[PDB]
């Protein structure tokens, strides 16, 4: 074994926190972990907004779809794509290529996952909040983001006050392909649907996820990004 | 606040030179298991991994990544992909062409990849992300036989390290982390960091990153994604 692996494998989203704050030294370490993430071309295109102002916390909770743990978490971090630093160094920077939004999205996930694992390694718990993107522009303006930047997701951190079971995922032989993409075996989806309702014990996982994707998935996001100068071509 | 997870995170270096020693089957199983334990937006599970063991494809991928020889010499090479094809194979009604979903695919891929890499690093392995595959995304896509609704994002080399670089410094936290609202860049923080990086090595950092972003960044990538059915609106 080792403690990093058991930390990774014991992951659960935590959505209920005690009122205990996170020590100043733990938070410094969590952010230090984030900053040690790999970075495409060393561009360093991620910014983090730490929200301590409780009026802003309450507004973010509402913008995220009334997720109360946005308010009650000890800390709330907002991960943002940031090409404003670069444009402030050299205004010829071309930040509107879709490639650069891919980079900002991937690098944000890498950094955020270092932050979360570092926190979980210390007995803390957390959850990602993609719900900020429901009202992306309102969140953007609330945190004062300039052009060439955009919100991607938030992250709640705190001392956990709940003990969920680990949720199973699709098996590695479904998700991992050897040398070339393998067509899906629908029997593996049926076996996994069974695993999920065992976990949850009417819609099965397969019906829920494809029900969600049959509709429109935040169709305001490309205009939002375009409005900040991003993903225009 | 210091355990071996934190120690692994902060001790991270990109490794680009590997010994010939293979990775044990048990270790690779654990690395992939660690990736599968990552958070997933809405439990969509939008990520696939192609593990490339065929040496001719390894050679081709090395070329397509920009002649990066460690693609070929790494013990294992993993290609991370956005995957909405599992969902469309479940229900052809799924709408996978929203930009929102490429965004989810990219973030979730970085989260999963970083679980894999940290797991590897915790075992004394090393590795490096290979975004260079996107230089030739379409040819890489055809080589791995990806269907519609999937797209490569980046690769990942893993192996037993045969170099030990020093840990490379990042922008300071007080530049990257903002309290409550976005903060303007102080160009003297860039000047300081430019000197910190010049020491690390011997164009400054800021000249190199901006002059790179002054050009076009992989302008073929939006057509690449659109040709796979993604990011069209
Ligand atoms: C990018 C991203 C955004 C997320 N956004 C939310 C959110 O807005 N609200 C929420 O409750 N959970 C959110 N989650 C948490 C997922 O629902 C959770 O990871 C998933 O259900 C699997 O559960 P687990 O993390 O406990 O293993 C998000 C996860 C990711 C990766
Ligand atoms: C998304 C992504 C793609 C990357 N692609 C490459 C690559 O193609 N070639 C390479 O040598 N390094 C690649 N890297 C590694 C970066 O060059 C590296 O993280 C940074 O320059 C080096 O800092 P480090 O030693 O702290 O990781 C990539 C990193 C990320 C996050
Ligand atoms: Cl957690
Ligand atoms: Cl890259």
Short mmCIF file of C-alpha atoms and ligand atoms in Angstrom, two decimals:
data_model
loop_
_atom_site.label_atom_id
_atom_site.label_comp_id
_atom_site.label_asym_id
_atom_site.label_seq_id
_atom_site.Cartn_x
_atom_site.Cartn_y
_atom_site.Cartn_z
CA UNK A 1 0.00 0.00 0.00
CA UNK A 2 0.81 3.55 0.99
CA UNK A 3 -1.12 6.42 2.49
CA UNK A 4 -1.40 8.37 -0.80
CA UNK A 5 -3.16 5.46 -2.46
CA UNK A 6 -5.52 4.85 0.42
CA UNK A 7 -6.21 8.60 0.43
CA UNK A 8 -7.07 8.48 -3.30
CA UNK A 9 -9.10 5.29 -3.04
CA UNK A 10 -11.02 6.43 0.01
CA UNK A 11 -12.34 9.54 -1.77
CA UNK A 12 -15.95 10.63 -1.20
CA UNK A 13 -17.54 14.02 -1.86
CA UNK A 14 -18.28 15.68 1.51
CA UNK A 15 -21.27 18.06 1.56
CA UNK A 16 -21.81 18.56 5.32
CA UNK A 17 -19.20 20.32 7.47
CA UNK A 18 -18.71 21.16 11.13
CA UNK A 19 -18.24 24.82 12.10
CA UNK A 20 -14.55 24.30 12.82
CA UNK A 21 -12.30 26.44 10.59
CA UNK A 22 -9.31 25.17 8.71
CA UNK A 23 -6.05 26.21 10.40
CA UNK A 24 -4.05 28.91 8.64
CA UNK A 25 -1.17 26.44 8.21
CA UNK A 26 -3.34 23.69 6.68
CA UNK A 27 -4.82 26.13 4.16
CA UNK A 28 -1.33 27.40 3.23
CA UNK A 29 -0.29 23.78 2.59
CA UNK A 30 -3.43 22.99 0.56
CA UNK A 31 -2.73 25.94 -1.73
CA UNK A 32 0.98 25.02 -1.90
CA UNK A 33 -0.12 21.56 -3.10
CA UNK A 34 -2.22 23.17 -5.81
CA UNK A 35 0.71 25.26 -6.99
CA UNK A 36 3.00 22.19 -7.30
CA UNK A 37 0.72 20.83 -10.09
CA UNK A 38 2.17 20.26 -13.58
CA UNK A 39 1.36 23.06 -16.08
CA UNK A 40 1.17 22.94 -19.92
CA UNK A 41 4.22 24.79 -21.33
CA UNK A 42 4.62 26.27 -17.82
CA UNK A 43 2.01 28.83 -18.83
CA UNK A 44 0.42 28.83 -15.33
CA UNK A 45 -3.02 29.71 -16.54
CA UNK A 46 -5.05 28.99 -13.36
CA UNK A 47 -6.09 31.53 -10.71
CA UNK A 48 -7.89 30.79 -7.44
CA UNK A 49 -10.30 33.16 -5.73
CA UNK A 50 -10.55 32.46 -2.02
CA UNK A 51 -13.96 33.68 -0.80
CA UNK A 52 -14.02 34.59 2.90
CA UNK A 53 -16.57 37.42 2.68
CA UNK A 54 -19.75 35.85 4.01
CA UNK A 55 -22.12 38.04 1.94
CA UNK A 56 -20.31 36.78 -1.17
CA UNK A 57 -20.47 33.20 0.14
CA UNK A 58 -24.24 33.50 0.47
CA UNK A 59 -24.61 34.90 -3.04
CA UNK A 60 -22.40 32.18 -4.50
CA UNK A 61 -24.54 29.54 -2.73
CA UNK A 62 -27.62 30.93 -4.46
CA UNK A 63 -25.89 31.32 -7.87
CA UNK A 64 -24.80 27.66 -7.62
CA UNK A 65 -28.41 26.51 -7.36
CA UNK A 66 -28.90 26.97 -3.61
CA UNK A 67 -26.12 24.60 -2.52
CA UNK A 68 -25.97 25.35 1.18
CA UNK A 69 -22.57 23.80 1.72
CA UNK A 70 -21.08 26.59 -0.40
CA UNK A 71 -21.95 28.77 2.64
CA UNK A 72 -21.17 26.42 5.50
CA UNK A 73 -17.82 25.07 4.25
CA UNK A 74 -14.79 26.31 6.17
CA UNK A 75 -13.21 27.49 2.91
CA UNK A 76 -14.53 28.05 -0.62
CA UNK A 77 -12.11 28.25 -3.57
CA UNK A 78 -13.13 29.31 -7.06
CA UNK A 79 -10.96 27.94 -9.87
CA UNK A 80 -10.61 30.27 -12.89
CA UNK A 81 -8.92 30.20 -16.30
CA UNK A 82 -6.53 33.14 -16.32
CA UNK A 83 -4.85 34.61 -19.43
CA UNK A 84 -5.11 38.13 -18.02
CA UNK A 85 -1.73 37.83 -16.31
CA UNK A 86 -0.23 37.08 -19.70
CA UNK A 87 -2.06 39.90 -21.48
CA UNK A 88 -0.94 42.26 -18.71
CA UNK A 89 2.64 41.24 -19.54
CA UNK A 90 2.16 41.58 -23.32
CA UNK A 91 -1.09 42.86 -24.86
CA UNK A 92 -0.38 41.03 -28.13
CA UNK A 93 -1.33 37.75 -26.35
CA UNK A 94 -4.02 35.95 -28.36
CA UNK A 95 -6.21 34.35 -25.70
CA UNK A 96 -9.27 33.38 -27.79
CA UNK A 97 -8.13 30.06 -29.27
CA UNK A 98 -10.16 27.06 -28.12
CA UNK A 99 -6.89 25.27 -27.45
CA UNK A 100 -6.23 27.71 -24.60
CA UNK A 101 -9.56 27.01 -22.94
CA UNK A 102 -8.76 23.23 -23.11
CA UNK A 103 -5.42 23.95 -21.42
CA UNK A 104 -7.06 26.13 -18.76
CA UNK A 105 -9.71 23.47 -18.11
CA UNK A 106 -7.25 20.56 -17.87
CA UNK A 107 -4.75 22.46 -15.75
CA UNK A 108 -7.51 23.63 -13.41
CA UNK A 109 -8.60 20.03 -12.84
CA UNK A 110 -5.00 19.00 -12.13
CA UNK A 111 -4.43 21.82 -9.62
CA UNK A 112 -7.77 21.44 -7.92
CA UNK A 113 -7.21 17.69 -7.48
CA UNK A 114 -3.85 18.35 -5.77
CA UNK A 115 -5.67 20.77 -3.43
CA UNK A 116 -8.40 18.26 -2.61
CA UNK A 117 -6.05 15.30 -2.06
CA UNK A 118 -3.80 17.39 0.17
CA UNK A 119 -6.86 18.38 2.19
CA UNK A 120 -8.23 14.80 2.34
CA UNK A 121 -4.78 13.57 3.39
CA UNK A 122 -5.14 15.67 6.52
CA UNK A 123 -8.56 14.28 7.41
CA UNK A 124 -10.44 17.15 5.79
CA UNK A 125 -13.17 16.72 3.19
CA UNK A 126 -14.47 18.56 0.20
CA UNK A 127 -16.55 18.70 -2.93
CA UNK A 128 -16.21 20.34 -6.33
CA UNK A 129 -18.96 22.84 -7.26
CA UNK A 130 -19.62 22.97 -11.00
CA UNK A 131 -22.96 24.64 -10.08
CA UNK A 132 -21.27 28.05 -10.18
CA UNK A 133 -21.54 27.72 -13.96
CA UNK A 134 -25.38 27.92 -13.76
CA UNK A 135 -25.07 31.70 -13.41
CA UNK A 136 -21.53 31.97 -14.70
CA UNK A 137 -21.57 35.65 -15.65
CA UNK A 138 -23.11 36.70 -12.33
CA UNK A 139 -20.42 34.74 -10.47
CA UNK A 140 -17.78 36.22 -12.80
CA UNK A 141 -18.90 39.82 -12.04
CA UNK A 142 -19.27 39.11 -8.30
CA UNK A 143 -15.59 38.05 -8.07
CA UNK A 144 -14.53 40.93 -10.33
CA UNK A 145 -12.96 38.81 -13.07
CA UNK A 146 -11.42 40.77 -15.96
CA UNK A 147 -11.28 39.92 -19.67
CA UNK A 148 -9.24 36.82 -20.57
CA UNK A 149 -10.47 35.07 -17.41
CA UNK A 150 -13.44 32.78 -16.67
CA UNK A 151 -14.86 30.74 -13.78
CA UNK A 152 -14.74 26.95 -14.13
CA UNK A 153 -15.82 25.53 -10.77
CA UNK A 154 -15.69 26.05 -7.04
CA UNK A 155 -14.47 23.75 -4.29
CA UNK A 156 -15.78 23.42 -0.71
CA UNK A 157 -13.32 22.39 2.01
CA UNK A 158 -13.90 21.69 5.66
CA UNK A 159 -13.99 19.31 8.57
CA UNK A 160 -16.50 16.63 7.51
CA UNK A 161 -19.73 16.09 9.40
CA UNK A 162 -20.98 13.05 7.43
CA UNK A 163 -19.61 9.65 6.41
CA UNK A 164 -20.81 8.62 2.92
CA UNK A 165 -19.82 5.30 1.42
CA UNK A 166 -17.35 5.31 -1.48
CA UNK A 167 -19.28 5.33 -4.79
CA UNK A 168 -18.25 2.70 -7.36
CA UNK A 169 -17.23 3.69 -10.88
CA UNK A 170 -17.34 1.90 -14.21
CA UNK A 171 -14.77 -0.94 -14.20
CA UNK A 172 -11.32 -0.32 -15.64
CA UNK A 173 -12.00 -2.80 -18.43
CA UNK A 174 -14.81 -0.51 -19.60
CA UNK A 175 -12.96 2.77 -19.21
CA UNK A 176 -9.44 1.65 -20.19
CA UNK A 177 -8.82 0.55 -23.79
CA UNK A 178 -5.77 -1.34 -25.03
CA UNK A 179 -4.21 0.13 -28.20
CA UNK A 180 -7.51 1.14 -29.79
CA UNK A 181 -10.97 2.24 -28.81
CA UNK A 182 -13.28 -0.70 -27.98
CA UNK A 183 -16.99 -0.52 -28.81
CA UNK A 184 -19.18 -0.54 -25.72
CA UNK A 185 -20.61 -3.85 -24.45
CA UNK A 186 -24.10 -2.94 -23.23
CA UNK A 187 -23.97 -5.87 -20.79
CA UNK A 188 -21.28 -4.03 -18.82
CA UNK A 189 -23.65 -1.08 -18.47
CA UNK A 190 -26.31 -3.41 -17.13
CA UNK A 191 -23.87 -4.94 -14.65
CA UNK A 192 -22.84 -1.44 -13.54
CA UNK A 193 -26.46 -0.24 -13.18
CA UNK A 194 -26.93 -3.19 -10.81
CA UNK A 195 -23.84 -2.18 -8.81
CA UNK A 196 -25.16 1.36 -8.48
CA UNK A 197 -28.59 0.42 -7.15
CA UNK A 198 -26.96 -1.94 -4.67
CA UNK A 199 -25.01 1.17 -3.61
CA UNK A 200 -28.26 3.15 -3.50
CA UNK A 201 -30.20 0.45 -1.57
CA UNK A 202 -36.13 4.19 -9.58
CA UNK A 203 -33.99 5.36 -12.52
CA UNK A 204 -30.75 3.48 -13.11
CA UNK A 205 -27.42 5.21 -13.61
CA UNK A 206 -27.58 4.72 -17.40
CA UNK A 207 -31.07 6.20 -17.61
CA UNK A 208 -30.19 9.16 -15.37
CA UNK A 209 -26.99 10.18 -17.20
CA UNK A 210 -28.43 9.81 -20.70
CA UNK A 211 -31.62 11.54 -19.57
CA UNK A 212 -29.44 14.48 -18.48
CA UNK A 213 -27.50 14.54 -21.79
CA UNK A 214 -30.61 14.17 -23.99
CA UNK A 215 -31.45 17.72 -22.87
CA UNK A 216 -29.28 20.79 -23.33
CA UNK A 217 -26.14 21.10 -21.19
CA UNK A 218 -25.69 24.71 -19.96
CA UNK A 219 -26.13 26.24 -23.44
CA UNK A 220 -25.17 29.70 -22.13
CA UNK A 221 -21.55 28.67 -21.49
CA UNK A 222 -20.06 29.33 -24.95
CA UNK A 223 -21.51 32.90 -25.07
CA UNK A 224 -20.24 33.38 -21.51
CA UNK A 225 -16.70 32.34 -22.45
CA UNK A 226 -16.86 34.37 -25.70
CA UNK A 227 -17.95 37.39 -23.69
CA UNK A 228 -14.74 37.16 -21.66
CA UNK A 229 -12.55 36.87 -24.76
CA UNK A 230 -12.22 33.08 -24.69
CA UNK A 231 -12.88 30.14 -27.02
CA UNK A 232 -13.80 32.29 -30.02
CA UNK A 233 -12.10 30.14 -32.69
CA UNK B 1 0.66 19.34 8.47
CA UNK B 2 3.02 16.93 6.65
CA UNK B 3 2.37 13.37 5.55
CA UNK B 4 3.60 11.31 2.61
CA UNK B 5 0.77 12.48 0.33
CA UNK B 6 1.80 16.11 0.80
CA UNK B 7 5.42 15.06 0.47
CA UNK B 8 4.62 13.37 -2.88
CA UNK B 9 2.64 16.38 -4.15
CA UNK B 10 5.34 18.94 -3.29
CA UNK B 11 8.16 16.67 -4.50
CA UNK B 12 6.69 16.49 -8.00
CA UNK B 13 8.99 16.77 -11.04
CA UNK B 14 8.25 15.97 -14.64
CA UNK B 15 10.37 12.91 -15.51
CA UNK B 16 11.42 12.64 -19.16
CA UNK B 17 14.08 9.93 -18.94
CA UNK B 18 13.17 6.41 -17.85
CA UNK B 19 15.04 3.18 -17.22
CA UNK B 20 14.11 0.01 -19.10
CA UNK B 21 12.44 -1.43 -16.01
CA UNK B 22 8.78 -2.25 -16.68
CA UNK B 23 5.96 -1.30 -14.34
CA UNK B 24 4.56 -4.31 -12.46
CA UNK B 25 1.06 -5.42 -13.43
CA UNK B 26 -0.07 -4.78 -9.85
CA UNK B 27 1.26 -1.21 -9.87
CA UNK B 28 -0.43 -0.39 -13.18
CA UNK B 29 -3.72 -1.84 -11.89
CA UNK B 30 -3.43 0.43 -8.83
CA UNK B 31 -2.51 3.49 -10.90
CA UNK B 32 -5.63 3.03 -13.07
CA UNK B 33 -7.75 2.25 -10.00
CA UNK B 34 -6.56 5.55 -8.54
CA UNK B 35 -7.68 7.42 -11.64
CA UNK B 36 -11.12 5.78 -11.47
CA UNK B 37 -11.55 7.07 -7.89
CA UNK B 38 -11.61 10.71 -9.07
CA UNK B 39 -14.65 12.97 -8.66
CA UNK B 40 -16.83 13.12 -11.80
CA UNK B 41 -19.19 15.96 -12.74
CA UNK B 42 -22.75 14.64 -12.31
CA UNK B 43 -21.31 11.13 -12.26
CA UNK B 44 -21.29 11.39 -16.07
CA UNK B 45 -17.93 9.53 -16.19
CA UNK B 46 -16.82 11.27 -19.40
CA UNK B 47 -13.18 10.05 -19.56
CA UNK B 48 -11.53 7.18 -21.42
CA UNK B 49 -7.91 6.03 -21.36
CA UNK B 50 -6.21 4.26 -24.26
CA UNK B 51 -3.24 2.30 -22.97
CA UNK B 52 -0.71 1.94 -25.81
CA UNK B 53 1.47 -1.17 -25.66
CA UNK B 54 2.02 -1.77 -29.37
CA UNK B 55 5.53 -0.53 -30.11
CA UNK B 56 4.79 0.65 -33.68
CA UNK B 57 1.95 2.86 -32.38
CA UNK B 58 4.27 4.05 -29.63
CA UNK B 59 6.73 5.07 -32.36
CA UNK B 60 4.01 6.85 -34.33
CA UNK B 61 2.73 8.62 -31.22
CA UNK B 62 6.24 9.71 -30.39
CA UNK B 63 6.44 11.35 -33.82
CA UNK B 64 2.97 12.96 -33.58
CA UNK B 65 3.77 14.41 -30.11
CA UNK B 66 6.57 16.40 -31.72
CA UNK B 67 9.37 13.81 -31.71
CA UNK B 68 9.34 13.37 -27.94
CA UNK B 69 11.43 10.24 -27.51
CA UNK B 70 10.18 9.45 -24.01
CA UNK B 71 6.77 8.68 -25.45
CA UNK B 72 8.47 5.59 -26.92
CA UNK B 73 10.82 4.80 -24.05
CA UNK B 74 8.31 5.12 -21.20
CA UNK B 75 7.25 1.91 -19.49
CA UNK B 76 3.60 2.84 -20.03
CA UNK B 77 1.85 5.42 -22.18
CA UNK B 78 -1.72 6.45 -21.44
CA UNK B 79 -3.82 8.66 -23.74
CA UNK B 80 -6.63 10.53 -21.97
CA UNK B 81 -9.78 11.19 -24.03
CA UNK B 82 -13.14 12.87 -23.65
CA UNK B 83 -15.78 10.16 -24.09
CA UNK B 84 -19.45 10.86 -24.79
CA UNK B 85 -19.59 7.79 -27.04
CA UNK B 86 -20.42 5.43 -24.15
CA UNK B 87 -23.45 7.64 -23.48
CA UNK B 88 -24.47 7.80 -27.17
CA UNK B 89 -24.07 4.00 -27.38
CA UNK B 90 -26.55 3.81 -24.48
CA UNK B 91 -28.97 6.33 -25.92
CA UNK B 92 -28.42 7.82 -29.39
CA UNK B 93 -30.59 10.79 -28.29
CA UNK B 94 -27.70 12.22 -26.25
CA UNK B 95 -26.61 15.76 -27.20
CA UNK B 96 -22.81 15.79 -26.86
CA UNK B 97 -21.95 18.89 -28.92
CA UNK B 98 -22.32 21.57 -26.20
CA UNK B 99 -19.14 23.48 -25.20
CA UNK B 100 -20.17 22.89 -21.54
CA UNK B 101 -19.43 19.20 -22.12
CA UNK B 102 -15.98 19.67 -23.59
CA UNK B 103 -15.30 21.82 -20.55
CA UNK B 104 -16.50 19.00 -18.21
CA UNK B 105 -14.52 16.44 -20.23
CA UNK B 106 -11.35 18.50 -19.94
CA UNK B 107 -11.61 19.28 -16.21
CA UNK B 108 -12.56 15.68 -15.35
CA UNK B 109 -9.64 14.35 -17.45
CA UNK B 110 -7.16 16.52 -15.55
CA UNK B 111 -8.63 15.37 -12.21
CA UNK B 112 -8.37 11.69 -13.21
CA UNK B 113 -4.89 12.00 -14.78
CA UNK B 114 -3.54 13.70 -11.68
CA UNK B 115 -4.85 10.86 -9.53
CA UNK B 116 -3.00 8.43 -11.79
CA UNK B 117 0.22 10.45 -11.74
CA UNK B 118 0.23 11.06 -7.98
CA UNK B 119 -0.47 7.40 -7.41
CA UNK B 120 2.50 6.53 -9.63
CA UNK B 121 4.76 9.10 -7.96
CA UNK B 122 3.82 7.79 -4.53
CA UNK B 123 5.30 4.39 -5.60
CA UNK B 124 8.58 5.95 -6.66
CA UNK B 125 7.62 6.07 -10.33
CA UNK B 126 7.73 9.26 -12.33
CA UNK B 127 6.09 10.67 -15.39
CA UNK B 128 5.11 13.63 -17.52
CA UNK B 129 1.96 14.84 -19.26
CA UNK B 130 2.18 14.90 -23.09
CA UNK B 131 -0.08 17.59 -24.49
CA UNK B 132 2.11 17.48 -27.56
CA UNK B 133 -0.21 14.85 -29.05
CA UNK B 134 -2.54 17.76 -29.87
CA UNK B 135 0.02 19.00 -32.44
CA UNK B 136 -1.41 16.26 -34.66
CA UNK B 137 -4.73 15.56 -32.92
CA UNK B 138 -6.55 14.26 -36.01
CA UNK B 139 -3.78 11.78 -36.93
CA UNK B 140 -3.53 10.58 -33.30
CA UNK B 141 -7.32 10.19 -33.23
CA UNK B 142 -7.27 8.05 -36.39
CA UNK B 143 -4.35 5.98 -35.07
CA UNK B 144 -6.26 5.05 -31.89
CA UNK B 145 -9.53 4.35 -33.76
CA UNK B 146 -11.62 6.85 -31.80
CA UNK B 147 -15.33 7.05 -32.71
CA UNK B 148 -17.48 10.14 -32.90
CA UNK B 149 -18.17 11.91 -29.58
CA UNK B 150 -14.62 11.21 -28.32
CA UNK B 151 -11.44 13.30 -28.62
CA UNK B 152 -7.84 13.01 -27.38
CA UNK B 153 -6.72 15.63 -24.87
CA UNK B 154 -3.23 14.58 -23.69
CA UNK B 155 -0.98 11.64 -23.02
CA UNK B 156 0.96 10.58 -20.00
CA UNK B 157 4.32 8.76 -19.76
CA UNK B 158 5.07 6.62 -16.71
CA UNK B 159 8.14 4.64 -15.77
CA UNK B 160 11.02 4.20 -13.39
CA UNK B 161 12.92 7.51 -13.43
CA UNK B 162 16.43 7.79 -14.81
CA UNK B 163 16.92 11.50 -14.00
CA UNK B 164 16.25 13.70 -10.97
CA UNK B 165 15.57 17.33 -11.84
CA UNK B 166 15.20 19.94 -9.17
CA UNK B 167 11.66 21.00 -8.31
CA UNK B 168 10.75 23.89 -10.54
CA UNK B 169 9.25 26.97 -8.83
CA UNK B 170 5.87 28.47 -9.68
CA UNK B 171 4.41 31.94 -9.39
CA UNK B 172 3.94 32.69 -5.65
CA UNK B 173 0.59 32.01 -3.98
CA UNK B 174 0.04 35.71 -3.42
CA UNK B 175 0.02 36.12 -7.23
CA UNK B 176 -2.09 33.06 -8.08
CA UNK B 177 -4.57 33.15 -5.13
CA UNK B 178 -6.84 36.18 -4.80
CA UNK B 179 -8.91 37.04 -1.73
CA UNK B 180 -12.60 37.61 -2.48
CA UNK B 181 -11.99 39.45 -5.74
CA UNK B 182 -9.57 39.35 -8.59
CA UNK B 183 -6.39 41.38 -8.02
CA UNK B 184 -4.41 43.30 -10.59
CA UNK B 185 -1.01 41.94 -11.54
CA UNK B 186 1.99 43.78 -10.12
CA UNK B 187 4.59 43.55 -12.86
CA UNK B 188 7.34 43.54 -10.23
CA UNK B 189 6.09 40.14 -9.08
CA UNK B 190 6.71 39.00 -12.65
CA UNK B 191 10.17 40.62 -12.60
CA UNK B 192 10.99 38.83 -9.35
CA UNK B 193 9.76 35.48 -10.68
CA UNK B 194 11.58 35.99 -13.99
CA UNK B 195 14.82 36.17 -11.97
CA UNK B 196 13.80 33.14 -9.89
CA UNK B 197 13.48 31.08 -13.06
CA UNK B 198 16.66 32.38 -14.70
CA UNK B 199 18.58 31.21 -11.64
CA UNK B 200 16.83 27.81 -11.88
CA UNK B 201 18.23 27.22 -15.40
CA UNK B 202 21.66 28.82 -15.86
CA UNK B 203 14.26 35.13 -23.08
CA UNK B 204 12.89 35.28 -19.57
CA UNK B 205 9.94 33.17 -18.46
CA UNK B 206 7.52 36.03 -19.09
CA UNK B 207 8.95 36.71 -22.55
CA UNK B 208 8.81 33.04 -23.49
CA UNK B 209 5.23 32.39 -22.36
CA UNK B 210 3.85 35.62 -23.83
CA UNK B 211 5.69 35.30 -27.13
CA UNK B 212 4.27 31.79 -27.39
CA UNK B 213 0.80 33.17 -26.69
CA UNK B 214 1.44 36.03 -29.14
CA UNK B 215 1.17 33.45 -31.94
CA UNK B 216 -1.73 31.19 -32.79
CA UNK B 217 -2.19 28.36 -30.29
CA UNK B 218 -2.95 25.09 -32.17
CA UNK B 219 -5.60 26.72 -34.36
CA UNK B 220 -6.66 23.34 -35.79
CA UNK B 221 -8.09 22.25 -32.41
CA UNK B 222 -11.64 23.65 -32.72
CA UNK B 223 -12.05 21.98 -36.18
CA UNK B 224 -10.59 18.80 -34.64
CA UNK B 225 -13.20 18.81 -31.85
CA UNK B 226 -16.03 19.82 -34.19
CA UNK B 227 -15.11 16.97 -36.55
CA UNK B 228 -15.66 14.53 -33.65
CA UNK B 229 -19.08 16.07 -32.84
CA UNK B 230 -17.92 18.14 -29.84
CA UNK B 231 -17.84 21.82 -28.88
CA UNK B 232 -20.09 22.95 -31.77
CA UNK B 233 -22.23 25.39 -29.75
C1 LIG C 1 -16.11 19.21 -12.16
C2 LIG C 1 -17.02 18.74 -11.03
C3 LIG C 1 -18.09 19.55 -10.62
C4 LIG C 1 -18.93 19.13 -9.60
N1 LIG C 1 -19.98 19.95 -9.20
C5 LIG C 1 -20.82 19.59 -8.16
C6 LIG C 1 -21.86 20.43 -7.71
O1 LIG C 1 -22.13 21.54 -8.23
N2 LIG C 1 -22.64 20.00 -6.67
C7 LIG C 1 -22.37 18.77 -6.07
O2 LIG C 1 -23.04 18.40 -5.13
N3 LIG C 1 -21.34 17.96 -6.50
C8 LIG C 1 -20.56 18.37 -7.53
N4 LIG C 1 -19.52 17.52 -7.92
C9 LIG C 1 -19.32 16.24 -7.16
C10 LIG C 1 -19.86 14.99 -7.90
O3 LIG C 1 -21.29 14.94 -7.86
C11 LIG C 1 -19.28 13.70 -7.30
O4 LIG C 1 -17.90 13.64 -7.62
C12 LIG C 1 -19.87 12.42 -7.91
O5 LIG C 1 -21.22 12.31 -7.57
C13 LIG C 1 -19.16 11.16 -7.40
O6 LIG C 1 -19.26 11.12 -6.01
P1 LIG C 1 -17.90 11.04 -5.12
O7 LIG C 1 -17.05 12.26 -5.45
O8 LIG C 1 -18.32 11.01 -3.68
O9 LIG C 1 -17.10 9.81 -5.44
C14 LIG C 1 -18.67 17.89 -8.96
C15 LIG C 1 -17.60 17.07 -9.37
C16 LIG C 1 -16.79 17.50 -10.42
C17 LIG C 1 -15.61 16.67 -10.90
C1 LIG C 2 -1.66 19.36 -19.83
C2 LIG C 2 -0.16 19.20 -19.87
C3 LIG C 2 0.50 18.83 -21.05
C4 LIG C 2 1.88 18.71 -21.04
N1 LIG C 2 2.56 18.35 -22.19
C5 LIG C 2 3.94 18.17 -22.21
C6 LIG C 2 4.61 17.74 -23.37
O1 LIG C 2 3.98 17.51 -24.42
N2 LIG C 2 5.99 17.59 -23.33
C7 LIG C 2 6.69 17.84 -22.15
O2 LIG C 2 7.92 17.69 -22.11
N3 LIG C 2 6.03 18.24 -21.00
C8 LIG C 2 4.65 18.40 -21.03
N4 LIG C 2 3.99 18.80 -19.88
C9 LIG C 2 4.82 19.02 -18.65
C10 LIG C 2 5.11 20.51 -18.47
O3 LIG C 2 6.10 20.92 -19.39
C11 LIG C 2 5.54 20.71 -17.02
O4 LIG C 2 4.45 20.46 -16.13
C12 LIG C 2 6.24 22.01 -16.67
O5 LIG C 2 6.92 22.57 -17.75
C13 LIG C 2 7.43 21.47 -15.96
O6 LIG C 2 7.27 21.62 -14.61
P1 LIG C 2 7.29 20.33 -13.65
O7 LIG C 2 8.64 19.61 -13.62
O8 LIG C 2 7.11 20.94 -12.29
O9 LIG C 2 6.17 19.36 -13.99
C14 LIG C 2 2.61 18.96 -19.87
C15 LIG C 2 1.95 19.33 -18.69
C16 LIG C 2 0.55 19.45 -18.71
C17 LIG C 2 -0.19 19.88 -17.45
CL1 LIG C 3 -13.72 14.75 0.50
CL1 LIG C 4 0.81 21.02 -24.43
#
